RNA sequence: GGGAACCCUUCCCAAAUGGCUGUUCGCCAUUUGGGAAGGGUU
RNA sequence: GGGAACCCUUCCCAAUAUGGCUGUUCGCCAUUUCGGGAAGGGUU
């Protein structure tokens, strides 16, 4: 039985679901905030990165859901589309105990009409970005009149000056009689001091201080701005990370670093706001399932993204905000693992490095690189097939896996992550078998129907 | 005397060629008389006998005022039955071939409301509808008559009866006050004629034929008891051996009972009444029209408007309550210049109905003696109907589906019906393969 | 700077809504989905 | 009477309409239907 039983609130169906999902022990933040959340209290939570906040507020809000009432009862706000999709997926996993629970995500990039159509049957839980959610609110396709609880993940980001007007506009559509949860790994005392405007007598649950990170080893390298790309290529060759995320402060630098890494054959994809949304989603899929070694991103990937066993984070340029520095490195060392975060520091970034040293109360570990080091190739172990259909075509992972193991004649150990999206299914297969799987699935059949299959770039 | 459509001096050469292609060689009397005033924009109330071209008479008039570039509703036509609405729409489509990209939509019950709502996003130029579903669409804002030029009521004496009065009034409140209004019918009791002027604006009354001037229909009456009508009917069918026949009854119960009594004696008979599924009604009409059945037993849902080509025989199993309904029934035969036969049964209690018919038509009844009472003869259907899934939404023009072993081809919105000689397994078209059912 | 939204064009591809000759395998027309590329919004 | 429209219930069949469900497939459920039948009730 799972430790969650000590809460003495969750139904046995949810306890069994947690046991099946492997949630055998409550993380500190779950143990600390779930009583108060299930009691209906407003909370502002500060726990370290990759320590279970999603389940912390998800179990809480799921406990107060009436599946028979097809109106929206829970609303979760995220700062980026990929993070919205991610926490929506985790909530759907946590909601298996309660059958026929509709969890819908509302972000830009998707066409507005398909979402308007899916909203005719109101979803129980909405996970959303502020722009598209406010668009749907002003046009009367979403009602918050039945809203029990409103969650703001990355709440210090949702309450900054950028999102402030959009948030104030959204809350105007929400009841005053609502539970309001705020979760983050960082709380600048400014955003913390103003956060009371959206809550009603909240409990401050600050279990992890600002300097209490997960087991992340940090290393800093002095370098001129011009030497950074050579140094990055040499360091990637030295470390040989199974996966790595490189962060830049601008999309121009992001794409430039991606291209410079690819010209030396270090398998790299780029993720920033100028990409189309299909490209953003597919890029994240491919990096997560092993179809690329390095992901180069702007701060659109700094927060919340849960990439499993990510081995390395590199700060090409230190982030403007030390809070964002903490979130970047937090992409590694999640769910109890360790990680490494290398950071470059040019003379213009001295102030950023000093503020990081002060905030984390650590003496920075400056590494000198080897005198000479060659540049090595980094090839991806996997490649991603994109099958047309998704949840709209009722494709569950068992169908793709059984078709791959049987009819097409592929080994069960040559297929990695299966990610079922609303309109497509992404499969990871080893690079040797990729073209074979593509050609045979072309004229093959999954779940009886014949489908369209693309090999992603 | 003959008059060509060019004598109207209004119709474009495209429309003149279209009429010549469709076999409208010379105008009928109702066309020659009503079309000048209709094209001049006058409201008209028109009488003309059955099977004399009233449909084309008002259709050409309203098509002359359509602007195909403006994709709003500009012409509305109301019908008493769904099958008649479909038929009038089809004739209007054939007449509208001179005008490319002309949307004529039919709004009737039985068909789902959602597909019609979707089709209404691109507003049609012409709507042919029954008042129920049309009013349902109007009140729900899916149809707008703001740009309406012409409103037409076929079978207007029925459209203005007490049953349809309120629905019609409801529909008119959505239409513009400045509109052209055309009322057409084969019959006009002077009471309903007097009340009809409320929907019109200075109408012109054109009574082409006096009430007793019918098409060349031979009328024969038979005395019979109530029971025994079915035996006498079976015997008359065995005697005359009609290629196509229509049997009218006053009740759906009698209709279905007569239909099944005809079927159990081996006489191919279909039924048509309001208690049927709408797909069933449409398929029944298609099968009876293309020759897949010899006899059609129907209620007064088939009394008005329907144009079955070269229908050979009509019988009144029971005389209609109203003589106006009687003339509409027999009018199903002897259409477009053909002759016909109309046999009527007369029980003791319907004798006064027979007498009122005699007075209205100013004809003395020709009573006939019963022929014989032996050997119920067979009446096999010459054709059989197959249903292809596809229709107009699958872009199936008749030529695609397409010798002389196949009769009529009926291209519907969702299906295509074809009559073959007395195909399925070999078909089970236009590149794509399709589902085929045997009716 | 980085996210989070949108409007204005202007051409492709595909599909909703119709039109087109009783010897098929297609051609139009309007609309809306992305595929773009052009400018503008917070 | 006969048409032209519904509304209640209450069971079928159907709908990638809207969702839910085991990582060795070809399926199983839920709601809605401005989708079709049945079987009683009513209404215009
Ligand atoms: N109780 C638990 N036991 C084991 N794993 C857990 C537990 N709770 C969460 N996880 C997993 O650990 C990771 C933490 O993800 P996340 O919820 O995003 O942490 P955070 O939002 O605080 O950064 C996820 O993969 C989550 O599924
Ligand atoms: N001018 C014409 N020449 C030849 N046939 C015609 C002409 N006008 C109509 N018809 C045909 O004669 C029949 C009359 O159908 P219809 O117009 O509905 O008669 P009704 O006057 O009773 O409404 C139909 O087959 C129609 O196509
Ligand atoms: F704090 Be986590 F990475 F959302
Ligand atoms: F008068 Be007809 F038969 F429409
Ligand atoms: Mg998180
Ligand atoms: Mg007529």
Work out how many domains chain A is built from and give that number: 3
Alpha-carbon distance values, A351 to A54, A217, A219, A220, A225 (Å): 33, 21, 17, 14, 15
Residue A28, domain extent: 3-206
Cα of A344 vs centre of ligand 5, distance in Å, is: 26
Using a 10 angstrom Cβ sphere, with 0-12 exposed, 13-18 middle and 19 or more buried, the burial of residue A366 is exposed
- Report the separation in Å between the CA atom of B51 and the middle of ligand 2, taken as the mean of its atom positions: 6
B354 lines ligand 4 (CB under 6 A): no
Residues 6+ apart with CB under 8 A from B294: B242, B243, B244, B245, B267, B268, B269, B379, B380, B381
CB A353 within 8 A of CB A315: no
SS (H, E, C) chain A: CCHHHHHCCCCHHHHHHHHHHCCCCCCHHHHHHHHHHHCCCCEEEECCCCCCHHHHHHHHHHHCCCCCCCCCCEEEECCCHHHHHHHHHHHHHHCCCCCCCCEEEECCCCCHHHHHHHCCCCCCEEEECHHHHHHHHHCCCCCCCCCCEEEEECHHHHCCCCCHHHHHHHHHHCCCCCEEEEEECCCCHHHHHHHHHHCCCCEEEECCCCCCCCCEEEEEEECCCCCHHHHHHHHHHHHCCCCEEEECCCHHHHHHHHHHHHHCCECEEEECCCCCHHHHHHHHHHHHHCCCCEEEECHHHCCCCCCCCCCEEEECCCCCCHHHHHHHHCCCCCCCCCEEEEEEECHHHHHHHHHHHHHHCCCCCECCCCCCCCCCCECCCEEEEEEECHHHHCCCHHHHHHHHHCCCCCCHHHEEEEEECCCEEEEEEEHHHHHHHHHHHHHCCECCECCCEEECC
Q: CA–C1' distance B89–D16 (Å)?
A: 34
In the 375-394 stretch of chain A, whose C-beta falls under 7 Å of nucleic acid strand C? none
Tell me the C-alpha to C-alpha distance, in Å, between residue B104 and each of A113, B120, B126, B270, B283. 28, 11, 5, 29, 21
Q: What is the CATH number of the domain that holds B16?
A: 3.40.50.300
- Is residue B312 a part of any domain in this protein? yes
Task: Judge if the beta carbon of residue B340 lies within 6 A of ligand 4.
Answer: no
Q: Which two tokens stand for residue A152?
A: 């703001």
B379 DSSP assignment: B
State the Cα–Cα distance between residues A265 and B404, nearest whole angstrom.
Answer: 71
DSSP state of B57: H
Q: In the numeric block, which tokens belong to residue B65?
A: 């005022």
Distance from the CA of A113 to the center of ligand 2, in angstroms? 47
Euclidean distance between CA atoms A67 and A69, whole angstroms: 5
- Closest residue to C28 (CA to C1') is B101
Q: Is A314 found in the same domain as A223?
A: yes
**Technique used to solve these coordinates:** X-ray
Residues 290-349 of A with CB within 7 A of strand C: 298-300, 320
Q: Answer for the pair B170, B96: CB distance below 8 angstroms, yes or no.
A: no
- Tell whether B375 is covered by a domain: no
| C-beta neighbour count of A89 within 10 angstroms | 18
Q: Is the CB of A330 under 6 A from ligand 3?
A: yes
Q: Closest nucleotide (CA of A392 to C1')?
A: D16
Q: CA-to-CA distance for A264 and B139, rounded, in angstroms?
A: 68
CATH number at residue A442: 3.30.70.330
Identify the burial level of B362 via C-beta atoms within 10 angstroms of its C-beta, where 0-12 means exposed, 13-18 middle and 19 or more buried. Answer: exposed
Mark whether B9 and B147 lie in a shared domain.
Answer: yes
Q: How far is the CA of B182 from the C1' of D37 (A)?
A: 39
Strand D nucleotides within 7 Å of a protein CB: 1-6, 16-38, 44
Contact A248, A300 (CB under 8 A): no
Element holding B270 (H helix, E strand): strand B269-272
Regarding whether A424 and A323 lie in a shared domain, the answer is no
> Minimum-distance ligand to the CA of B304?
4
C-alpha A145/C-alpha A122 separation (Å) is 12
- Determine the distance separating the centroid of ligand 2 and the alpha carbon of B24, expressed in angstroms: 9
The first and second tokens of residue A434, run together, are 């990729």
Q: Is the CB of B108 under 7 A from strand D?
A: yes
* Rounded Cα gap, residues A96 and A30, in angstroms: 19
Of all ligands present, the nearest one to the C-alpha of B310 is: 2
In this structure, which residues have their CB less than 5 angstroms from ion ligand 6? B 54-55, 305
* Span CA (B210) to C1' (C1), Å: 90
CA dihedral A26, A31, A32, A35 (to 10 degrees): 140
Strand nucleotide closest to residue B161 (CA to C1')? D3
Residues A247, A274 share a domain: yes
From CA B58, how far away is CA B128, in angstroms rounded?
A: 12
**Closest C-alpha among A161, A119, A166, A165 to residue A144:** A119
CA A438 to centroid of ligand 4, rounded, Å: 64
CA distances from B246 to A83, A190, A350 (A): 70, 88, 99
Kindly give the distance from the C-alpha atom of residue A194 to the centroid of ligand 1, in angstroms, as a whole number.
28
How far apart, in Å, are the Cα atoms of A173 and each of A72, A133, A136, A137, A164? 13, 11, 11, 7, 15
Q: What is the dihedral of CA A60, A66, A67, A69, to 10 degrees?
A: -140
A47 is in an annotated binding site: yes
Q: Which of B141, B174, B207 is the last residue of a domain?
A: B207
Instruction: Tell if B414 CB is < 7 Å from nucleic strand C.
Output: no
Place of tokens 């009430």: B211
Answer yes or no: is B54 a known binding residue: yes
Separation of CA A158 from chain center: 16
Q: Which nucleotide is nearest to A408 (CA to C1')?
A: D25
Domain termination residue (choose one: B164, B179, B207): B207
Q: Identify whether residues A98 and A220 lie together within a single domain.
A: no
Tell me if B48 is assigned to a ligand binding site.
Answer: yes
* Same domain (yes/no): B200, B242: no
B344 known ligand binder: no
Instruction: Kindly state whether residue B325 falls inside one of the protein's structural domains.
Output: yes
Asked whether residue B141, judged by its CB, lies under 7 Å from any atom of the DNA or RNA strand D, the reply is no
Residue B58 CB–ligand 2 contact under 6 Å? no
Q: Which residues contact A307 (CB under 8 A, 6 or more apart)?
A: A243, A245, A287, A288, A331, A334
Is residue A365 in some structural domain? no
Resolution of the experimental model in angstroms, please? Answer: 3.0
User: Can you tell me the distance from the alpha carbon of B103 to that of A191, in angstroms, rounded to the nearest whole number?
Assistant: 61
Q: Does residue B387 sit in the same domain as residue B308?
A: no
Q: How many CB atoms lie within 10 A of CB A20?
A: 12
Q: Are residues B55 and B170 in the same domain?
A: yes
Domain end, chosen from B361, B396, B426, is at B361
Task: Give the orientation angle of helix B29-39 with respect to helix B54-63, to 10 degrees.
Answer: 20
The verdict on B282 and B247 lying in the same domain is yes
**Domain assignment present for A377:** no
A393 Cβ contacts chain D strand, under 7 Å: yes
Q: Whose CA is nearest to atom 5 of ligand 1?
A: A23
Report if residue A117 sits inside a domain. yes
The residues with which A204 forms a beta bridge, in sequence order, are A44
B371, part of any domain: no
- Ion ligand 5: residues, CB within 5 A, are A 53, 304
Same domain, A415 and A329: no
Take residue A280 and report the two structure tokens written for it: 């953003």
Question: How many angstroms is C1' of D24 away from CA of A98?
Answer: 27
- Separation CA B6–CA B76 (nearest Å): 26
Which phi and psi angles does B417 have, rounded to 5°? -100, 135
Task: Give the DSSP letter string of B237-264.
Answer: HHHH--SSEEEE-SSHHHHHHHHHHHHH
Q: Is the CB of A304 under 6 A from ligand 3?
A: yes
Residues A140 and A36 in one domain: yes
Each residue of B269-288: b (16+ CB within 10 Å) or e? Answer: bbbbbeebeeeebbbbbbbb
CA distances (Å), origin B305, targets A359, B1, B191, B284, B384 = 89, 25, 21, 17, 25
For B186-209, give one letter per residue: b (16+ CB within 10 A) or e.
Answer: bbbbeebbeebeebbeebeebebb
State residue B218 phi and psi, 5-degree precision.
Answer: -85, 125
Interval between CA B410 and ligand 6 midpoint (Å): 20
Q: Strand D contacts (CB < 7 A) among B residues 59-88? A: 80-83
Q: Could you tell me the distance in Å between the CA of residue B119 and the C1' of nucleotide C16?
A: 9
Q: Are residues A49 and A160 in the same domain?
A: yes
């Amino acid at each position: 039985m799972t430790a969650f039983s000590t809460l003495n609130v969750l139904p046995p169906a949810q306890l069994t679901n947690l046991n099946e999902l492997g949630y055998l022990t409550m993380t500190p933040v779950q143990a600390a905030a779930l009583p108060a959340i299930l009691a209906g209290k407003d909370v502002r939570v500060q726990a370290k990165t990759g320590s279970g906040k999603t389940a912390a507020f998800g179990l809480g809000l799921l406990q107060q859901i009436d599946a028979s009432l097809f109106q929206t009862q829970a609303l979760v706000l995220c700062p980026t589309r990929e993070l919205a999709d991610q926490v929506a997926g985790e909530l759907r996993r946590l909601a298996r105990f309660l059958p026929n629970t509709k969890i819908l995500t509302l972000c830009g990039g998707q066409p507005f009409g398909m979402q308007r159509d899916s909203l005719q049957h109101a979803p129980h839980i909405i996970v959303a970005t502020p722009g598209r959610l406010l668009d749907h609110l002003q046009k009367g396709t979403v009602s918050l009149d039945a809203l029990n609880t409103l969650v703001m993940d990355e709440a210090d980001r949702m309450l900054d000056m950028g999102f402030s007007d959009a948030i104030d506009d959204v809350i105007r559509f929400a009841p005053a009689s609502r539970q309001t949860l705020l979760f983050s790994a960082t709380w600048p005392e400014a955003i913390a001091a103003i956060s009371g405007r959206v809550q009603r007598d909240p409990l401050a649950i600050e279990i992890d201080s600002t300097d209490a990170l997960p087991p992340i080893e940090q290393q800093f390298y002095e370098t001129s701005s011009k030497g950074k790309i050579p140094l990055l290529q040499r360091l990637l060759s030295l470390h040989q990370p199974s996966s790595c995320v490189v962060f830049c402060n601008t999309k121009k630098d992001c794409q430039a670093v991606c291209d410079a890494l690819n010209e030396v054959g270090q398998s790299a994809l780029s993720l920033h706001g100028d990409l189309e949304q299909r490209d953003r989603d597919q890029t994240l899929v491919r990096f997560a399932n092993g179809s690329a070694r390095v992901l180069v991103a702007t701060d659109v990937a700094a927060r919340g993204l849960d990439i499993k066993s990510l081995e390395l984070v590199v700060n090409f340029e230190l982030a403007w905000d030390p809070e964002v520095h903490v979130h970047r490195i937090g992409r590694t060392a999640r769910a109890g693992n360790s990680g490494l975060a290398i950071s470059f520091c040019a003379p213009e970034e001295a102030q950023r490095a000093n503020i990081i040293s002060d905030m984390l109360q650590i003496k920075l570990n400056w590494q000198t690189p080897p005198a000479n080091s060659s540049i090595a190739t980094l090839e991806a172990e996997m490649a991603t097939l994109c099958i047309d259909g998704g949840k709209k075509a009722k494709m569950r992972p068992g169908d793709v896996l059984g078709a791959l193991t049987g009819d097409i004649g592929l080994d069960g150990a040559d297929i990695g992550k299966i990610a079922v999206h609303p309109a497509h299914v992404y499969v990871a297969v080893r690079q040797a078998v990729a073209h074979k799987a593509w050609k045979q699935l072309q004229g093959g059949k999954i779940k009886g129907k014949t489908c369209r299959v693309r090999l992603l770039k």
